[PDB]
Structure 1
Amino acid sequence: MNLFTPLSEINPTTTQELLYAYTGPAPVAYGTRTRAVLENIIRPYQYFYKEPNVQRALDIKTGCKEPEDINVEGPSSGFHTASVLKLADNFFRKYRPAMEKLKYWILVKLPKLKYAELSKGRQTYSFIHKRNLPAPIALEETVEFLEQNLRRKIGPTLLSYCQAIADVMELDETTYEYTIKFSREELWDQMRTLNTMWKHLERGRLNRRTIATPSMLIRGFVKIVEDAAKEILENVPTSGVPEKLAKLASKQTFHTAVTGELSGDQEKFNECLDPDAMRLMWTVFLRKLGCPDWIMELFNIPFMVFKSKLADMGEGLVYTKGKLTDRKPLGEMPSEFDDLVRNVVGNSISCRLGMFMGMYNLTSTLLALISIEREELTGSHVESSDDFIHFFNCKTHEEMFKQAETLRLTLKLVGINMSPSKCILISPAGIGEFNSKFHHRDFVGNVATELPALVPNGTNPMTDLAMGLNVIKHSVNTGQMNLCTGALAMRIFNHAYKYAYMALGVTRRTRFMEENAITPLLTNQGASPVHSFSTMHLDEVALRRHLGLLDEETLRRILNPNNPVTEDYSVPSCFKY
C-alpha cells in the first residue's frame, strides 16, 4: 500500500485510480439467493424501532413514526408524515421552472407516450408461461391478453394501456387462450409478485446483492413515474445527473470564511425506505402544482402495487444433514428467519415496508433532494442513488457541527441513514469524492468503473472496430485516459482485433491469402494499421484511399451494393457479414 502513496512530483489523488481491481474476474454469484433476499426483506423490520422487535413491526402498514422513536445511533426505517409534508413544501418553494416544465410534460405530451417502446425493457417473467422471457414477446403476449379479455383494441397511447389494465383487472374470471385461466386473486398475486435475481458483474463490495424486476403489467406505471423523475431531475442544479461536481467546486469563497466537504455513502439504502413517504411527496407536489384526481390515481397506483410486494425467496434455504446438501423452503424447518414464516405466501413472501434494487433509483434521489432542502442548511448537495457529496460554507466550526448534525437527522427523518463509517468530512474544502469522480484543489479526476473492453463485440469486423474506437474516444474525452493510455489501449485493441479474425500467425485464412496471391489491404485482412491517436472518429475505408493505400477497383469490388452479404458510423461493405 505504501507503493501507492507518493510524496513528491505527484499527489495521491491522481494515483488513487490505482485503487481499483481492474483486469480481474468480477465476482459471480452461485446457488440460491434465498438468504440474501430474506436478509433484504428482514433488515427494514429490524430498524423500525430502537429496540429490535421484528414481530411488532410485521403488522406495520405505514412507516409513519415519531421523532422519539427514530434511532440516531443506528439505521432507522420509516418516516415522519409531518416532516415529509414540510420538506416537500420547502422543495416546492424553490425550483419553480422545473415544476413548470413537468406541468408542460403532464399537460402536453405525457399521454403522447406509447407502449411499443416499453419493448426496450429488461427481461420479464411471464405470468402465463411461468418463465423468464424477453421484453418483446412479453409485450406481444400482454397486448394479446388485453385485447382478448377487454373485447376492444388497445390504443397506441400508454394511457390507453393504463385504462385497459384498470378495466381488465375488474373482469374477475379471465383466461389467456392451452386455455390458461385466471382469477382476481391470481391477478392480484401476479401484481404483488416481484422477481428477484442475482446481480451479475458487480464490483465494489464483498457481499453480493439481489436486484428485483417487476411484472410487465406494472412496468408502464413504474416507467412513467421514473420519467417524471427524469424531467424533474434534469433541471435542478443540486441533482447528480447532468459536470455538476466541477461547476460546484468552481466556487471561490472569501478568505474570512470556512468551506468544508462531506463525501458519504448509504448503509441499506434499499432497506430503510417506505413507499408511503414517496406517495406523500408525489401527492403533495402534484396537488400543489395543479394535477387532477385521475393524475393522483395514475401516479399513486405504482406504490399501491409495491406496498404489497411478493418478492420470490429464490429457491430456499440451504440445509445439510451430513455431507449432503438440500434446498428447503422457508417454514419447513426452523431457521433464523422464523419471524417471516407467517408472511410466506406460497413460493413468495409478503413485505409491506421495504425496498428492492432495480425499482426506483431516481425517485429515491428525489426524496433525498426534498430532504436536504431546509432553512439552516445553507450548503450545496449532490445526490446519486446511495452516494452523496455536500459542501458547507459558514463562519465557525460549531455551525458546521450543527448543520451536519441536522442534515443527518433530516435524512434519517425519511429513512436514508447515511453511513457513519463511509461519510468523510473535511472541514477545509478542496478534496472531495462523488460517484466515480475525485476532486483535488481545482482538478477533477474521472475514473471508469470498467476499463474499455479492448475486444471486438462479435457482430462483424468493421462495426466492432468502430465501437472500440468510439469507446476509446469516449474514455479519453472524459479524462479517464490520456495520450499514452489511449495509444496503448488502441494498440491492445488492434492486437485483439487482429487475433480474433485470424489476422495473426499462420492459419486457414492466412493460407487463403497466401495461396490466392491476395495481399492484405485492411486491418482485419492483416494489413498494417492506419488509425492514429487523433483518428478516433474516422472510417475504416477512409484515410486509406486518401493516403493511397487502397485502389478504387477493390473499392468498387467491396462497396458494390449487389453483394450477397450486407454511434456506428460504418459504411456498408461486403465484409459486413
Structure 2
Amino acid sequence: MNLFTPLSEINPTTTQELLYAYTGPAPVAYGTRTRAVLENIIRPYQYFYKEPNVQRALDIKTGCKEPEDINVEGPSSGFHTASVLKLADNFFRKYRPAMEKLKYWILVKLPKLKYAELSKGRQTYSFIHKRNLPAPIALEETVEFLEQNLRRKIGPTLLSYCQAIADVMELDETTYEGARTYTIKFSREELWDQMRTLNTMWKHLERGRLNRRTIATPSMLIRGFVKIVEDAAKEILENVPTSGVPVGGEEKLAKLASKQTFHTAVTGELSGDQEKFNECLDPDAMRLMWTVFLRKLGCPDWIMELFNIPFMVFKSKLADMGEGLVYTKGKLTDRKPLGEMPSEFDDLVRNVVGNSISCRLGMFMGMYNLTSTLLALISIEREELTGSHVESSDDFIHFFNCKTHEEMFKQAETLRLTLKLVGINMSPSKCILISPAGIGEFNSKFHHRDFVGNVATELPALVPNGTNPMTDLAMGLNVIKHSVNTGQMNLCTGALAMRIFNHAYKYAYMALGVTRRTRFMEENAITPLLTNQGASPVHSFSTMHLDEVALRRHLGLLDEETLRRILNPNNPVTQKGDPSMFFRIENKMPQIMEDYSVPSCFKYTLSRNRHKALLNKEERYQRVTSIINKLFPEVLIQEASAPGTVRESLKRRLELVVERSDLDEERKKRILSRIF
C-alpha cells in the first residue's frame, strides 16, 4: 500500500482510484439465503434493548422506547415517539417552501399519477404464480385480478388502483381466472399474507463487501401504495438543502460544494455511514413523521390513511425464508427449515408462517430510501445543530463551523444522539471527523481541493454492449465522452480507453487477424471502409460525439457509391417483418404505409438462440398499440383522449381518413364495405 501513498507530486486522494480491484471478477452468492434472511430478521430484535433479549422483543408491535432505553454504545432499534413528533414539527416549521411543494403535489400531481408507472419496475414477486415475474406481467395480472373480483373497470390513475386494492381486501373469497383454464383460490387471510410477503433472494455481482447480502422484492399489492409515499418524499426532498438523495451526478457535486464553506476558527468535516440501516428503522416512525407533515399541512383524513397503508403493511411483513438452513451429520449436506432442529435462530420459530417469517421491527429492505432520508433529516432540525448536513439514505456528510473544539465535539455528539432518537445509528468504525475541514467523502466521492476524478468506476462500462456494431461503437464512445466531461478521465486516459475499446470492439466482430469474416472479405476483394470491418479508426478524441458514417463521408474515407449501399432503406439485412407508416409533410395523403428497413446494413439483429398466455396477451396488446399508432398519429405526441372504446374509435377514425382520401365516392364505398 506504500506504492499508493505519494508524498511529493500528487496526494493520496488522487490515488484513491488505485484502491479498486475492478476489471477483476465480482463476487457471487452460491447457496442458501436462509442464514442471511434469518440474520436480518433477528438483528432488529437484538438491538431493541441495551442487553440483547430476543425473547422479550418478539412480542412488541410498535417499537417505541424511552430515552433511557436508547443504546448509545451500540445499534438501537426503535424510536422515541415524542422526539419524532417534535422533530417532525421542527422540520415542518422550517423549509416551508418544501411543504408548499408537497401541497402542490398532493393537489395537482397526485391525482394525475397513473398506475402504469408501476410497470417501470424490475422483477416483481407475483402473489398468483408465487414466483418473480417482470413488472409489466405482474401489474397486468394484478389489474385483471382486481377487475374480475370487483366486477368493474380500474381507472388509469394510481388512486383508483389503490382503492381497488383496498376494496378487494374487504372480500371474503377472491378468485383468479387466467388462460394457460386454471383457477386459484384466495381467502382474506391468504390474500393478506400474499400482500405482506417479500420474496427474498441473493444479490449477485456486488462489489465492495466481504459478506453477501440478501435483497427482497414486494408484490404488486403494495408497490402501488409505496409509489405515492415515495413520490411525495421525492417532492419534499427536492426542495430541502439537507437532502442529497434526489440529486445526482454533477448536481450533487454542486450541492456539496455549496456547503463546503469553512470560515470559522474550528471548521470540521464529518463523513460517515449509518450502521444496520434498513433494520433499525421502525415503519411506525415514518408513519408518525408523515402524519405530522399532513396534519400541519391541513390535509384531510383519506390522504393520511393512504400514506399510512404501506408502512403498516411493512409492519406486518412476511419475509420469505430461503430453501432451508444447511445441516450436516458427517460430510453430508442437507437443507432443513428453521423449526425442524435447533439452531442459532430457534427464538424466531414462533414467527414462521409457512415458508415465510414475520418481523415487526425494521424495514428489511430499501423500499423507503426517500422516506428514510426524510426521517434522518427531521432529526437534524434542532437548536444545538448549526452545521450543514447532507444525507442520501445512510451515507451522510456533515460540515461544522464552531468557535471551539469542545463546541464541535458537543455538536457531533448531539448529531449522533438525535440520529439515534429516530432509530438511526452512526457506524462508529465508519464515521471519521477531520477537525480542519477540507478532506471528506460522500457516496464514494473524495474531495481535497475539488472532487477528484475516480477512474475504475468507468471501466466496467468499457466492454462492447453486444447489440450491433453501430450501436456498440456509438454508446461506447459516448460513455467515454461522458467520463471525460465529468472529469473522471482526462485526455490520455480518454484516448487510451478509446483505443482499448476499439481493439476489443474490432475483436468481438471478427475484424482482427485471420477469421472467417476477414477471409471472406479478402477472397472477395471487399475493402473494409468501416471500423467494425477492420478499417483504421476514424474517430478521434475530439470526434467521440461524431457518427462514424457521417464523419467518414465528410473526410472522403467512404465514397458515395458505397454510401448508396450501406444506407439503403430496403436492404434485406435489416428488413422489418411488417409494413410501417410514414408521415408526408404537406401532401394530399399525409400518411403512407410501406415496407421499411433500418437504413444501416450493420444494424442487424443477433439471434438470441433460445405465464405463456400472458405473453400472447402482450403480443395482442402490441398489435392493438401498433394499429392505434398507425391510425392516430396525434397520440404519438400527446396522451390519448379519444372517447369510446378502441373498436369504435378506430372505426370512426378509419372512416374519416377514407372520406379525406381524395378518391372516387364509390371507391370509398367499396373500401368501407369490408371494414369489420
Sort the TM-score into its range (normalised by shorter chain). Answer: over 0.9
Report Cα offsets for 1:386-418 as digits up to 9, x if no partner. 211000001001101111111100001111110
* Residue correspondence of structure 1 range 65-144 to structure 2 within 5 A: 65-144=65-144
Task: Give the deviation of 1:366 after TM superposition.
Answer: 1.0
In 2, the alpha carbon distance for the partners of 1:214 and 1:104 equals 29
In 2, the alpha carbon distance for the partners of 1:383 and 1:454 equals 31
Confirm or deny: 8 A CA contact 1:122 1:135 kept in the other structure.
yes
Report Cα offsets for 1:267-304 as digits up to 9, x if no partner. 10122110000000011001211221111111110011
Confirm or deny: 8 A CA contact 1:250 1:442 kept in the other structure.
no
Residue 484 of structure 1 aligns to a residue whose secondary structure is helix
Report Cα offsets for 1:130-183 as digits up to 9, x if no partner. 222211221221111111111111111111111111112212111101111111
Task: Give the deviation of 1:358 after TM superposition.
Answer: 3.4
**1:443–1:29 Cα change, 3 Å:** closer
In 1, the alpha carbon distance for the partners of 2:450 and 2:492 equals 23
Confirm or deny: 8 A CA contact 1:274 1:354 kept in the other structure.
yes
Q: Which residue of 1 aligns with 2:601?
A: 574
Residue 344 of structure 2 aligns to a residue whose secondary structure is coil
Confirm or deny: 8 A CA contact 2:260 2:399 kept in the other structure.
no
Task: Give the deviation of 1:234 after TM superposition.
Answer: 1.7
Confirm or deny: 8 A CA contact 1:124 1:216 kept in the other structure.
yes
Q: Which residue of 2 aligns with 1:241?
A: 245
Confirm or deny: 8 A CA contact 2:390 2:397 kept in the other structure.
yes
In 2, the alpha carbon distance for the partners of 1:361 and 1:300 equals 16
Any unmatched runs of 5+ in structure 1? none
**1:258–1:327 Cα change, 3 Å:** same
**1:203–1:252 Cα change, 3 Å:** closer
Report Cα offsets for 1:505-540 as digits up to 9, x if no partner. 111111121122110011111111111111222112
**1:306–1:279 Cα change, 3 Å:** same
In 2, the alpha carbon distance for the partners of 1:11 and 1:183 equals 65
**1:247–1:565 Cα change, 3 Å:** same
2:535 to 514, 527, 544: 527
In 2, the alpha carbon distance for the partners of 1:438 and 1:306 equals 36
In 2, the alpha carbon distance for the partners of 1:196 and 1:359 equals 13
Confirm or deny: 8 A CA contact 1:498 1:504 kept in the other structure.
yes
In 2, the alpha carbon distance for the partners of 1:356 and 1:458 equals 36
**1:106–1:550 Cα change, 3 Å:** same
Residue 188 (structure 1) aligned with residue 192 (structure 2) = yes
Confirm or deny: 8 A CA contact 2:568 2:599 kept in the other structure.
no
In 2, the alpha carbon distance for the partners of 1:447 and 1:156 equals 45
Confirm or deny: 8 A CA contact 1:466 1:568 kept in the other structure.
no
Confirm or deny: 8 A CA contact 1:27 1:201 kept in the other structure.
yes
**Worse-matched range after superposition: 80-89 or 521-530:** 521-530
Residue 179 of structure 1 aligns to a residue whose secondary structure is strand
Task: Give the deviation of 1:483 after TM superposition.
Answer: 1.1
Confirm or deny: 8 A CA contact 2:196 2:318 kept in the other structure.
yes
Confirm or deny: 8 A CA contact 2:201 2:216 kept in the other structure.
yes
Q: Which residue of 1 aligns with 2:350?
A: 342
Task: Give the deviation of 1:251 after TM superposition.
Answer: 5.9
Task: Give the deviation of 1:109 after TM superposition.
Answer: 2.0
Task: Give the deviation of 1:250 after TM superposition.
Answer: 5.4
**Worse-matched range after superposition: 254-263 or 77-86:** 254-263
**1:472–1:255 Cα change, 3 Å:** closer
In 2, the alpha carbon distance for the partners of 1:443 and 1:167 equals 52
Confirm or deny: 8 A CA contact 2:278 2:366 kept in the other structure.
no
Task: Give the deviation of 1:563 after TM superposition.
Answer: 2.4
Report Cα offsets for 1:455-474 as digits up to 9, x if no partner. 22112111111111121122
Residue 350 of structure 2 aligns to a residue whose secondary structure is helix
* Residue correspondence of structure 1 range 140-539 to structure 2 within 5 A: 140-177=140-177, 178-241=182-245, 243-249=251-257, 257-446=265-454, 449=457, 451-539=459-547
Task: Give the deviation of 1:307 after TM superposition.
Answer: 0.5
Confirm or deny: 8 A CA contact 2:505 2:532 kept in the other structure.
yes
**Worse-matched range after superposition: 233-242 or 49-58:** 233-242
Confirm or deny: 8 A CA contact 1:63 1:78 kept in the other structure.
yes
In 1, the alpha carbon distance for the partners of 2:599 and 2:307 equals 46
Task: Give the deviation of 1:360 after TM superposition.
Answer: 1.5
**1:430–1:254 Cα change, 3 Å:** closer
Task: Give the deviation of 1:444 after TM superposition.
Answer: 4.1
In 1, the alpha carbon distance for the partners of 2:215 and 2:261 equals 43
Q: Percent of pairs identical after alignment? A: 100
In 2, the alpha carbon distance for the partners of 1:166 and 1:256 equals 55
Confirm or deny: 8 A CA contact 1:47 1:77 kept in the other structure.
yes
Residue 197 of structure 1 aligns to a residue whose secondary structure is strand
**1:574–1:12 Cα change, 3 Å:** same
In 2, the alpha carbon distance for the partners of 1:570 and 1:90 equals 62
**Worse-matched range after superposition: 8-17 or 250-259:** 250-259
In 1, the alpha carbon distance for the partners of 2:259 and 2:293 equals 31
In 2, the alpha carbon distance for the partners of 1:164 and 1:170 equals 10
Confirm or deny: 8 A CA contact 2:22 2:460 kept in the other structure.
no
**Worse-matched range after superposition: 130-139 or 364-373:** 130-139
Confirm or deny: 8 A CA contact 2:376 2:391 kept in the other structure.
yes
Report Cα offsets for 1:163-204 as digits up to 9, x if no partner. 111112212111101111111111001011111111122111
Task: Give the deviation of 1:248 after TM superposition.
Answer: 4.2
Task: Give the deviation of 1:256 after TM superposition.
Answer: 5.5
**Worse-matched range after superposition: 456-465 or 342-351:** 456-465
**1:474–1:571 Cα change, 3 Å:** farther
Task: Give the deviation of 1:246 after TM superposition.
Answer: 4.7
Task: Give the deviation of 1:571 after TM superposition.
Answer: 8.5
Confirm or deny: 8 A CA contact 1:436 1:447 kept in the other structure.
no
* Number of corresponding residues: 577
Confirm or deny: 8 A CA contact 1:439 1:445 kept in the other structure.
no
Structure ID, larger Rg:
2
**1:5–1:287 Cα change, 3 Å:** same
TM-score relative to the length of structure 1: 0.96
**1:496–1:254 Cα change, 3 Å:** closer
Residue 557 (structure 1) aligned with residue 565 (structure 2) = yes
Report Cα offsets for 1:84-126 as digits up to 9, x if no partner. 0111011111212222112111101212111223212110122
**1:255–1:226 Cα change, 3 Å:** closer
In 2, the alpha carbon distance for the partners of 1:267 and 1:357 equals 14
**Worse-matched range after superposition: 199-208 or 243-252:** 243-252
In 2, the alpha carbon distance for the partners of 1:251 and 1:209 equals 34
Greater RCO, 1 or 2 (C-alpha within 8 Å, sep 6+): 1
Task: Give the deviation of 1:452 after TM superposition.
Answer: 3.8
Residue 409 of structure 2 aligns to a residue whose secondary structure is helix
Q: List structure 1 segments (4+ residues) > 6 angstroms apart after TM superposition.
A: 567-571
Task: Give the deviation of 1:247 after TM superposition.
Answer: 4.8
**Worse-matched range after superposition: 83-92 or 550-559:** 550-559
Confirm or deny: 8 A CA contact 1:454 1:496 kept in the other structure.
no
Let me know the Cα RMSD of the aligned residues. Answer: 2.4
In 2, the alpha carbon distance for the partners of 1:206 and 1:249 equals 32
Confirm or deny: 8 A CA contact 1:229 1:363 kept in the other structure.
yes
Confirm or deny: 8 A CA contact 1:486 1:533 kept in the other structure.
yes
